[PDB]
Structures are given as structure tokens and as C-alpha cells.
Design a protein around this nucleic acid. Structure first.
Ligand SMILES: Nc1ccn([C@H]2C[C@H](O)[C@@H](COP(=O)(O)NP(=O)(O)OP(=O)(O)O)O2)c(=O)n1
Ligand SMILES: [Mg+2]
Ligand SMILES: [Mg+2]
Length: 428
DNA sequence: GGCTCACACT
DNA sequence: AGTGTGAG
């Protein structure tokens, strides 16, 4: 309960969608490159950006036309379009390539299309018994940064010189004859993550970064400290200095309104300033669960488990119809429900063959023009047959009384979003 | 900005 | 069963 019981890693692919396209098209490699969807509006919306393009200021959610003003040589790859919508199939398949490799090492929790947490606690005990008392060379950690090192009293004017000196200070001081030390466990964790990152790159051509620490939140934070193509070890001891200047919003789950209340109500900026408040005081402001979570977390302690889940629990297809393009006829709503239902059907049949399960509930969601909320409305029905016409007709049946227009041909208010989601999966 | 996913709350 | 937050 100093939050040092587990070794947890978070592995995240570098500029993932870009790398998928660069692997396929060698002309894009080692260049300023972005991935875009819907090429016809302002050149497309950027969804992923190479490190070479980031150095010109190009970011996610820029329009390509705009990104081209910062980087005129920027190269683009377009997301596949099918039935009038962006289709992410090539990136989900590439994801499967990566997840299957990691799952050879340990139990993973698929956290996104491009990252997974790894509980390495057992793999570490077993690796610590294999090298009996035998030390750990820097050569086993060729890409690892030890966060908060080097410290104290040429080389270190270069990034690779600092990395090494810190690693050397860390290793020089490790107590290897003691198999229970949390720091030693982390070190062996990092060795394993080197091997995992090497296998990923060898087997896929994709580079990634990772964090190694005692829990998910720290592992995720660590990962991003030395992107791209590097891994970062955040020990329990590094936490006070690390947290002392770490904006609250950088910690996973605190990037939104909760994080903002924490800052506003308590009158603080940094994760470390949370240590001054009693658990009861945090619970008073933020509730029993969040207050307890904050109190532990600001001291580097979190217990959320790496869940044994490699598969998504829901399979969704959605499309926005912004501004003037909002859907305004019954016929038009039906046609799009059908396009969504067809893609979903293909994805479900594949899921059923691959993963030996079937979805049993269909969720329909919409947004009406005028609504401020991402969803105006969710309704659900039975999913008894992977049949796109049935699924489309059922989703229409379920929403059609949201229609204010008595003309019945027309649809009001116009719809700015449709979403179909298969959920409540059972084995078969 | 657009297409996804997970989960807490009621 | 339905809504809202947070992430990637
Ligand atoms: N808002 C977002 C964030 C991510 N994505 C997709 C595209 C990203 O390549 C992929 C993984 O997201 P990410 O890990 O947050 N960023 P990415 O892998 O591109 O770069 P780094 O992790 O190297 O920064 O999810 C998206 O489509 N919309
Ligand atoms: Mg990534
Ligand atoms: Mg990611």
C-alpha cells in the first residue's frame, strides 16, 4: 500500500495511423506526413501527424488546407471511404497485429486502437528467478529513460548522453540481491518491455513508446514523457518531484470537468499540491470515490486493475451531418441508417467468426439540429440477426417518433448525427 | 472539427 | 433503460 505491488506497462504506438500508411507506402516514410478523412472539405480533417510534421506545428484536427500553410511539403494519406463514410478497417487490423504480439508476453487490457496495458508482475517474478542474483547491464535497456535521473554531480549536452547517465546512476544504485525491491521489479519490467517493443517493431515495422511503473495512470504518464520510440521508467520515488510541477490535467481522467473543479475549488495547479488535503476533505468536494482516488493518486498510488480484455465490448458505426447537410427527409434518414447497418453487419460477421461471440442488442443514437449535447437520444432493441436491412428498419422503427413533421416525408428537426452500436455480446 | 470506445451515475 | 464524461 505504498502502491508498489505491481509492475504495469502502457505501450502506445507512435503516430499510429501515419505508421500504418508509411509501412504500406514507402514514399511517405521519414517525411512530414498526416492522415486525413473526407478529402473534399478543406482538404480533409487531420487525424494523425508524423513527428516530422509536428516539428512544423501541424496538429490533429487541423484541416489539411491549413496544415499545408505551416508545412507546404506535407504529404497526406486518406482514410478509406466506404458507403460515404470513413472506414477504419485498415487501422483496426493493424491494431490486431500489435495486440497479438503483446499478448504473447502477458495479459493485456486493450485500452485503445493503439495502446494496451500489460500486467508484468508475474513475468517479472519469473524473470528474477531465471537470472539468479546476476546483474542488469545497461545493454538490456537500450531505449529506457529513468524519470528524474540523472541528478547531482560534454556527454549530457546530448539527449542520448543524459539518457545513459541517468540509466547508469539508476543501475549503479540498484539492490539486485533483493528480489522484493519495487525498483528492481520495475527494472526487470523494463527489460521485458524492451523485448516486447523489439518484437513489435520486428514483426510489424511499427515503432512505439512505453511507460513502466506500478499502476496504469503512472504507466500512461511515463509513456508520453519520451515519445517517440523510447520507454520511460517512473519509480515510486520519482513521484514527489515529478508531481510537484505536473498540471492536474495531464493525469488520465482529470483532463475534463473533474480536473477543472479540482483546480478551481482547491485553488491549486499541480498534482503534488493535492497531498496537503485530507482524504475526507477531497471526498467532501469530489465525492467518496473520486476523493479516495485523488488522495491515493497524488501520492503515486492507484489500484485500478489491468483488465483481461483484448476485444472491444461494443462495435459502433457513426456519421455526422453538420450544418446544411443535416438529414431532413424520411427517405434520406433511412438510406444512411442502411449504409451504417451494412458496415456494421460486415464488422459483426467478421467478429463472430474471429472471436466466437454474437451481439444481442442494437443501440440507436441520434442528434437533432439545435441540440447542444453530443447525443440527443439513445434507444435500443434486440439484435437477433446480423442483417443490415433488419437492423436498419429496426433502428428506424425505434427513432421515427422523434420526427416533429406531420408531412411525414420531411423530417424535423433535421438530424446532424446517426450512430448504430452492437453491444451485449454472448459466447457462441 | 469526425469516428470510435469505456464506464459512472441515475 | 437512458444520460453524461473522458479518452484516443
Ligand atoms: N482524437 C483522436 C485521437 C486519436 N485518433 C487515432 C489516430 C491516432 O493515430 C490513433 C492513436 O492515438 P494517439 O496514440 O492518441 N496518437 P498517435 O499514435 O497518432 O501519436 P503518439 O501516440 O505518437 O502521439 O488514434 C483519432 O482518430 N482521434
Ligand atoms: Mg499513439
Ligand atoms: Mg494512444
Amino acid at each position: 500500500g505504498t502502491g508498489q505491488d505491481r509492475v504495469v506497462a502502457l505501450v502506445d504506438m507512435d503516430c499510429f495511423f501515419v505508421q500504418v500508411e508509411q509501412r504500406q507506402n514507402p514514399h511517405l516514410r521519414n517525411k512530414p506526413c498526416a492522415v486525413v478523412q473526407y478529402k473534399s472539405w478543406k482538404g480533409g480533417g487531420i487525424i494523425a501527424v508524423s513527428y516530422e510534421a509536428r516539428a512544423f506545428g501541424v496538429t490533429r484536427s487541423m484541416w489539411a488546407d491549413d496544415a499545408k500553410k505551416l508545412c507546404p511539403d506535407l504529404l497526406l494519406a486518406q482514410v478509406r471511404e466506404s458507403r460515404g463514410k470513413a472506414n477504419l478497417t485498415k487501422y483496426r487490423e493493424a491494431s490486431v497485429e500489435v495486440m497479438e504480439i503483446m499478448s504473447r508476453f502477458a495479459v493485456i487490457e486493450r485500452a485503445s486502437i493503439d495502446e494496451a496495458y500489460v500486467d508484468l508482475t508475474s513475468a517479472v517474478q519469473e524473470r528474477l528467478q531465471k537470472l539468479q542474483g546476476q546483474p542488469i547491464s545497461a545493454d538490456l535497456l537500450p531505449s529506457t529513460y529513468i524519470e528524474g535521473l540523472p541528478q547531482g554531480p560534454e556527454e549530457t549536452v546530448q539527449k542520448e548522453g543524459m539518457r545513459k547517465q541517468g540509466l547508469f546512476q539508476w543501475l549503479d544504485s540498484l539492490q539486485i540481491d533483493n528480489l522484493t525491491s519495487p525498483d528492481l521489479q520495475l527494472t526487470v519490467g523494463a527489460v521485458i518491455v524492451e523485448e516486447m517493443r523489439a518484437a513489435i517493431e520486428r514483426e510489424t515495422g511499427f515503432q512505439c513508446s512505453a511507460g513502466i511503473s506500478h499502476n496504469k495512470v503512472l504507466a500512461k504518464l511515463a509513456c508520453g514523457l519520451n515519445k517517440p520510440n523510447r520507454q520511460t521508467l517512473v519509480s515510486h520515488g520519482s513521484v514527489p518531484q515529478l508531481f510537484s510541477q505536473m498540471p492536474i490535467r495531464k493525469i488520465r481522467s482529470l483532463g475534463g470537468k473533474l480536473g477543472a473543479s479540482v483546480i478551481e475549488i482547491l485553488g491549486i495547479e499541480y498534482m503534488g499540491e493535492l497531498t496537503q488535503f485530507t482524504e475526507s476533505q477531497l471526498q467532501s468536494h469530489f465525492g467518496e470515490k473520486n476523493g479516495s482516488w485523488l488522495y491515493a493518486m497524488c501520492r503515486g498510488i492507484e489500484h485500478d486493475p489491468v483488465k483481461p480484455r483484448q476485444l472491444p465490448k461494443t462495435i459502433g458505426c457513426s456519421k455526422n451531418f453538420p450544418g446544411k447537410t443535416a438529414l431532413a427527409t424520411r427517405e434520406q434518414v433511412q438510406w444512411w441508417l442502411l449504409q451504417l447497418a451494412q458496415e456494421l453487419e460486415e464488422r459483426l460477421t467478421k467478429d463472430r467468426n474471429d472471436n466466437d461471440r454474437v451481439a444481442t442488442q442494437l443501440v440507436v443514437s441520434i442528434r437533432v439540429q439545435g441540440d447542444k449535447r453530443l447525443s440527443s437520444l439513445r434507444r435500443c432493441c434486440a439484435l437477433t440477426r446480423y442483417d443490415a436491412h433488419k437492423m436498419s428498419h429496426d433502428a428506424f422503427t425505434v427513432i421515427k417518433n422523434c420526427n416533429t413533421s406531420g408531412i411525414q416525408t420531411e423530417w424535423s428537426p433535421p438530424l446532424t448525427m446517426l450512430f448504430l452500436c452492437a453491444t451485449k455480446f454472448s459466447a457462441s
